[PDB]
Amino acid sequence: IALTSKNLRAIEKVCSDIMKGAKEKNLNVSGPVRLPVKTLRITTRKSPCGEGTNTWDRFELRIYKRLIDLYSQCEVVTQMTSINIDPVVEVEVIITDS
Amino acid sequence: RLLEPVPFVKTNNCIKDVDADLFIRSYATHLKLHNKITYPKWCTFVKTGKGRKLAPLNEDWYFIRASSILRRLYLHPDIGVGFLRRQFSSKQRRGVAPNHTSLASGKILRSILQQLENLGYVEQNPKKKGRRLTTKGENAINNFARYINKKVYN
Amino acid sequence: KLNHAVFIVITPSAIAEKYKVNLSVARAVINHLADSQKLYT
Amino acid sequence: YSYIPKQNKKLIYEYLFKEGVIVVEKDAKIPRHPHLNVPNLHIMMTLKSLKSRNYVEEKYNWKHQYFILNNEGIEYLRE
Amino acid sequence: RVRTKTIKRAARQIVEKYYAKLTLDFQINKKITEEVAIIPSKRMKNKVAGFVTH
Amino acid sequence: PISKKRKFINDGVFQAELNEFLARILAEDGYSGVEVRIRELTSLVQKRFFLCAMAQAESLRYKLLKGLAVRRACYGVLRHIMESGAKGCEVIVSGKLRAQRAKSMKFRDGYLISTGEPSKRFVNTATRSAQLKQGVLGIKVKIMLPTSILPDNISVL
Amino acid sequence: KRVQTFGKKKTAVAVATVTNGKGLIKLNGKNLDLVEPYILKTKVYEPLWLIGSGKLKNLDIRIRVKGGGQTSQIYAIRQAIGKGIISYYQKYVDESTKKELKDVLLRYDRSLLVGDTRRCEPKKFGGKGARARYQKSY
Amino acid sequence: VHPKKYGQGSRQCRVCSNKHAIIRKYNINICRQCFRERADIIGFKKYR
RNA sequence: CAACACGGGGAAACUCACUAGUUUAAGACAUUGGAUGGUGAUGCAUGGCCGUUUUUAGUUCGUGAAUGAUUUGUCUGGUUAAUUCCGAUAACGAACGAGAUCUUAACCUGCUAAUUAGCGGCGAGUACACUGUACUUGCUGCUUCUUAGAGGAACAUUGUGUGUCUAACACAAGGAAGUUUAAGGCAACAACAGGUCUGUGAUGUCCUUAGAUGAACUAGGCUGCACGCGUGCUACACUGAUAUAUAUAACGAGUAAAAUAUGCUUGCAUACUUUUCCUCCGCCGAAAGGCGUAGGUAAUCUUUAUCAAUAUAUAUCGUGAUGGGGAUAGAUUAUUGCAAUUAUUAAUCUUGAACGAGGAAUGCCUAGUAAGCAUGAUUCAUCAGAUUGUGCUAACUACGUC
Numbered sequence A: 001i002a003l004t005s006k007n008l009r010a011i012e013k014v015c016s017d018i019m020k021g022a023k024e025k026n027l028n029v030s031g032p033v034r035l036p037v038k039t040l041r042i043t044t045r046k047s048p049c050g051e052g053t054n055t056w057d058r059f060e061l062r063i064y065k066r067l068i069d070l071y072s073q074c075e076v077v078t079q080m081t082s083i084n085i086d087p088v089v090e091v092e093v094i095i096t097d098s
Numbered sequence B: 001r002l003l004e005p006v007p008f009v010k011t012n013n014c015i016k017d018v019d020a021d022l023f024i025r026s027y028a029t030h031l032k033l034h035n036k037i038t039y040p041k042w043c044t045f046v047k048t049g050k051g052r053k054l055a056p057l058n059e060d061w062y063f064i065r066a067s068s069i070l071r072r073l074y075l076h077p078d079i080g081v082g083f084l085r086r087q088f089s090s091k092q093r094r095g096v097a098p099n100h101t102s103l104a105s106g107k108i109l110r111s112i113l114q115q116l117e118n119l120g121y122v123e124q125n126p127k128k129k130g131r132r133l134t135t136k137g138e139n140a141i142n143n144f145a146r147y148i149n150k151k152v153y154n
Numbered sequence C: 001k002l003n004h005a006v007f008i009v010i011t012p013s014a015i016a017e018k019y020k021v022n023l024s025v026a027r028a029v030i031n032h033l034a035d036s037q038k039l040y041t
Numbered sequence D: 001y002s003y004i005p006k007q008n009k010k011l012i013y014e015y016l017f018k019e020g021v022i023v024v025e026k027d028a029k030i031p032r033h034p035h036l037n038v039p040n041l042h043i044m045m046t047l048k049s050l051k052s053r054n055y056v057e058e059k060y061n062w063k064h065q066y067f068i069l070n071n072e073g074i075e076y077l078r079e
Numbered sequence E: 001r002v003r004t005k006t007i008k009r010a011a012r013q014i015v016e017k018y019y020a021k022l023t024l025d026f027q028i029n030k031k032i033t034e035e036v037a038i039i040p041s042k043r044m045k046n047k048v049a050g051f052v053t054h
Numbered sequence F: 001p002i003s004k005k006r007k008f009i010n011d012g013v014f015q016a017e018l019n020e021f022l023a024r025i026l027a028e029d030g031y032s033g034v035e036v037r038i039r040e041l042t043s044l045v046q047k048r049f050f051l052c053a054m055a056q057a058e059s060l061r062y063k064l065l066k067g068l069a070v071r072r073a074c075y076g077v078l079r080h081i082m083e084s085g086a087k088g089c090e091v092i093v094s095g096k097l098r099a100q101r102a103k104s105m106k107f108r109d110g111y112l113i114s115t116g117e118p119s120k121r122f123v124n125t126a127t128r129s130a131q132l133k134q135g136v137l138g139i140k141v142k143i144m145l146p147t148s149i150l151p152d153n154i155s156v157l
Numbered sequence G: 001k002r003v004q005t006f007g008k009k010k011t012a013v014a015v016a017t018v019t020n021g022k023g024l025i026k027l028n029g030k031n032l033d034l035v036e037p038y039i040l041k042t043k044v045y046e047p048l049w050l051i052g053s054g055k056l057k058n059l060d061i062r063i064r065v066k067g068g069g070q071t072s073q074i075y076a077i078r079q080a081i082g083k084g085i086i087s088y089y090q091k092y093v094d095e096s097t098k099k100e101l102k103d104v105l106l107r108y109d110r111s112l113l114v115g116d117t118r119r120c121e122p123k124k125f126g127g128k129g130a131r132a133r134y135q136k137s138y
Numbered sequence H: 001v002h003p004k005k006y007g008q009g010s011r012q013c014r015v016c017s018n019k020h021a022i023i024r025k026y027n028i029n030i031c032r033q034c035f036r037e038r039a040d041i042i043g044f045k046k047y048r
Numbered sequence I: 001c002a003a004c005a006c007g008g009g010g011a012a013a014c015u016c017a018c019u020a021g022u023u024u025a026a027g028a029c030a031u032u033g034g035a036u037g038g039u040g041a042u043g044c045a046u047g048g049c050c051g052u053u054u055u056u057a058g059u060u061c062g063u064g065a066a067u068g069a070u071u072u073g074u075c076u077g078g079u080u081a082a083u084u085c086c087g088a089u090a091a092c093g094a095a096c097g098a099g100a101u102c103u104u105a106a107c108c109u110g111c112u113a114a115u116u117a118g119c120g121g122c123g124a125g126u127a128c129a130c131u132g133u134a135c136u137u138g139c140u141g142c143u144u145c146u147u148a149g150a151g152g153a154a155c156a157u158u159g160u161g162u163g164u165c166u167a168a169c170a171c172a173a174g175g176a177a178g179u180u181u182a183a184g185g186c187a188a189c190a191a192c193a194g195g196u197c198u199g200u201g202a203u204g205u206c207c208u209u210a211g212a213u214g215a216a217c218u219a220g221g222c223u224g225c226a227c228g229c230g231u232g233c234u235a236c237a238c239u240g241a242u243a244u245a246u247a248u249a250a251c252g253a254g255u256a257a258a259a260u261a262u263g264c265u266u267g268c269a270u271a272c273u274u275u276u277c278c279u280c281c282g283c284c285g286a287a288a289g290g291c292g293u294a295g296g297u298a299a300u301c302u303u304u305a306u307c308a309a310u311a312u313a314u315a316u317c318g319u320g321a322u323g324g325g326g327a328u329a330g331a332u333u334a335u336u337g338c339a340a341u342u343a344u345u346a347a348u349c350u351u352g353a354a355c356g357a358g359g360a361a362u363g364c365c366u367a368g369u370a371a372g373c374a375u376g377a378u379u380c381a382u383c384a385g386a387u388u389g390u391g392c393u394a395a396c397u398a399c400g401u402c
Helices: A008-024 A074-084 B020-034 B061-075 B081-087 B106-118 B135-153 C012-018 C023-034 D006-019 D040-053 D071-077 E005-016 E026-036 E042-053 F004-025 F038-049 F053-065 F070-083 F116-122 G038-056 G070-093 G095-108 H032-042
Strands: A002-005 A028-045 A056-071 A090-092 B090-094 B097-102 B122-124 B131-133 D056-058 D067-069 F088-095 F103-110 F123-132 F135-144 G002-009 G012-020 G025-027 G059-066
Touching: A002 A008, A008 A028, A008 A056, A008 A074, A028 F004, A028 H032, A056 F004, B020 B061, B020 B135, B061 B081, B061 B106, B061 B131, B061 B135, B081 B106, B106 B122, B106 B131, B131 B135, C012 C023, D006 D040, D006 D067, D006 D071, D040 D056, D040 D067, D067 D071, E005 E042, E026 E042, F004 F038, F004 H032, F053 F070, F053 F123, F053 F135, F070 F088, F070 F103, F116 F123, G002 G070, G012 G070, G038 G070, G038 G095, G059 G070, G070 G095
Parallel strands: G025 G059
Antiparallel strands: A002 A056, A002 A090, A028 A056, B090 B097, B122 B131, D056 D067, F088 F103, F088 F135, F123 F135, G002 G012, G012 G059
């Protein structure tokens, strides 16, 4: 199960939730794998008319990706996923296991 | 310069024990002696890359280049022609404007690659990217490495 | 100037001074004697 | 050759009544909309007239034109 | 370097109600100051601990 | 479908576009939650895709539109903000101000903070253009509120 | 068995793998002999003199290099060899011999015991350098 | 009319329709003067 | 200055506002009146935003005190980047700014983790060497390194001097680091009649509004050229050019036109299928480039345990505008596009200008900097000599003063 967010705290909250969630059905998990951070970087000139000293500022939209995976039957993981969700994080389910 | 004393142990059988240039020239000379390799004809006339404009000014350069490619093959296993063009890259003086990188001529590389393959020293597999080495060629490179290693040592 | 013709301590510049010749001609004299940069020691 | 397209106007009126709202953006060159393959310009001119007559209210945010049909407009339009 | 008024004021409050918890050691003082005062930064806490030790 | 980088920007752009659409509507409160009076608004957006500062600032701009005196209006609005529990506030009114010759006037009270990321964290802000009879006023409202507290607190018991 | 260390100057990182052995020194797939520049040849020969042959002769060293150019990479390799030599004598041989060895290394230089502290300063608008600026004019 | 499918007239700032200073990086399609207003609501924050 | 590679404004058309003209309705309301639009006028009507003031410690309040504007607080003195602290004192107590906060980079946790990272474990070969080493295909307990989370670490720690021997400073030692560790971000008070109405359905007023200053379409123009001044690039050679060889990098960035089949009169209509951004790889091409395909929503494929160039090693010149230099021009075949014809861009061969290290003047710079050498990104159908990042190669000189 892959978790992608732009918010650190929300992704970490989901981490604690999934750890509890896994232990509820006593599942066999591989520890949460944090994938390389992608930052959407815009280096932006200050001034709408391009005045004065040139002056650039660097804006960052930093997205966090993490993956936690489970060896368990298909029904169990989808049902676990549906109880575990919150609106902000992007969830992908890739488990075909048994 | 040619040889210095050192305290550590070495492998003593591979290109990773060898002076690259000495090895490249010797194998090229050996290959030309054998007469497996051919220039051929048109390749006497050509240019080696627009970053140069010129050519190597040595008349045995193609054999040298073939040998140099074969060394790159021993280093890097499954490489292909675009990798070769990039490998032999240099800077190109853009006239009054600043430099940008420029490939070696791709036909000479392709011709060598094909010629080595025809002479059985490399094999294109269905697996992965391009040509890797044939064992007979590797054993010969090792034998030449051994000859040089003995020659320096005694 | 006049330091260039074909016919008549180890280091090429000294040879080029001594016989009044080019560094190419000096190197050729070095090669005949022996029978980047290089080690003359 | 071709003139003013009354049949297209009649179709547009039906679509407007059925929904009670239209979101379709400003540009007149495009004729493709998810519910409509008739030019934006024709509908836009009719909406301008309806707004003026006070049968439609506009809300506007950078080319997004959020048109709502009014209760007086519903009764008048219906046939 | 020096130490600002907030640091000095916090240090002045300390000792006054808390000398019987204080000691010579800076690392123990760092623990005591953390225990006693709910200082929001490590940098600030270390400075207050340092000046209280001083 | 498209990359996460493309996805997240597209979501952000849509969020801005909806927020600006909402801003044209706005009166009663700041927000009332996403839906996956209000019925008609929901219908418009569903067609399309197929306390806090702004309310106070908007209230002030309506009062300016009503022709109430600027000083009286600003004093009242500022007082309401502080009364309702702001720890500090600054309201700036820029522009013509009953004359041809434009000016600005700042009206601050309380612990209004400008420095650092604590300012960004605890100061809630709202900008409003009021087009009036003689041309235009720019209102800039800043309200400082806790959510814990400022780092300048020593926190010794 | 195995003991592990690394060295880090600028980008470059050289990880050293010191196993029980017989006096072999490698750099990735390549023998230590293939560094190539004469100056940088000496730079990695330096620790070999500092520990001599007979203390090298029961260990093999393999080194794994990523990042930087040659002068940075060789200094990372040299640091990795220094730390590597010490780690073997701390895990296998003796603390006292390790201290004696470290004293020798320290007497030669600090740079094969403690890495570089210099790291790049970002470019900022208004000039080609970090600090250097485009010409003013009147 | 006679249309042009590429170059300057093929594109605009999505917000304001102006053809100048448009960020096409990551396919934003907003001119930076408009974008700096909205970059926070889009989700960007500056740090350097 | 803080205008002048500045208007993110790298202009073939489109662009464009200009020039020559050709068109068009896309005129709400009751073709007539009437309104509706304007990269038109007005930044000395204005909003917003940005620059300066100014990268520096200054601003303000409450009450008290000192015909009044006004002043104290906000300071003799010590100290500091610091209205920073100590200290002092008609003031005492505050609040804002700064400091603290926040982002990197710096070092350490037989703690947290193993996927699209490694390591070992262990099968299979080819070579080499002996009482093991090198290299690929095949399968699969560790986490040091790759990644990314949490947490530690400097407080002047210790010592010795100096200092009201107060706030504090100086040196040495310890230490990964000792100035607030180095670098950023955020940037008050009060201004400027600075810039921007050609960024904006922010916008007053004014002009104009159908032989329209709107929309739209065709050319030409923005690079014109007796000539003058800014900013940059490239050179003037031998510590170098030329040709091979050896090494290697970080930050990155990447998915509605066309083609083909069928019916009709080279053309049209209908059906149906790929390309589309990055191209490995394999063929063909001196070369540019072409053709055939494969993986890529991306730690997986392009491709990054290797994607640069200066480095460095061996060869060729040998001080002569020389083989330095590449201005300037001719002849080609390519590439993007309807359009390349003001050399668009590209390569091939030839062509071989000034310039012998820069006068008066004047710019930037103190540690991974400065300088050199590259390269990604931005605009982009088409294009880096620009800007903005990123790395490698790694200097000098005080180390301070008015």
